[PDB]
Design a protein around this nucleic acid. Structure first.
Lengths: 65, 63
DNA sequence: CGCGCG
DNA sequence: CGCGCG
């Protein structure tokens, strides 16, 4: 599905960046060319599945867990 | 914008200055998306034309 | 301004 | 779930 494609693209991006390196949803949205709204829906979903770690803040930072 | 803004002000007035309602209610009653019912409501509240009552969801009435 | 919301 | 957000 398209949703699974976006999940895979996000995970690959965070995996390439660095396991202990985090970035914003805004950065993910721009780099992948996907609406921030869809990036966040996927980001919070993955974080709920424990695959990603959300760093408390504003805006929230994201990294591979 | 003046378009939608006067419709919401009218509804809440016909409702009665003492009575308050939600954006979700206004959205269905007026047949307008909640996203913009809220853009107008928050604007009108800032302009002092409306009073927002704290809560989840917020209640809206004529100031 | 944090927003992901169906 | 409060969301108005460009």
């Amino acid at each position: 599905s398209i949703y699974q494609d976006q999940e895979q693209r996000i995970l690959k991006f965070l995996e390439e960046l660095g396991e202990g390196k985090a970035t914003t949803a805004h950065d993910l949205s721009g780099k992948l060319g996907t609406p921030k709204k869809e990036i966040n829906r996927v980001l919070y979903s993955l974080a709920k599945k424990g695959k990603l770690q959300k760093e408390a803040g504003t805006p929230p930072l994201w990294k591979i867990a």
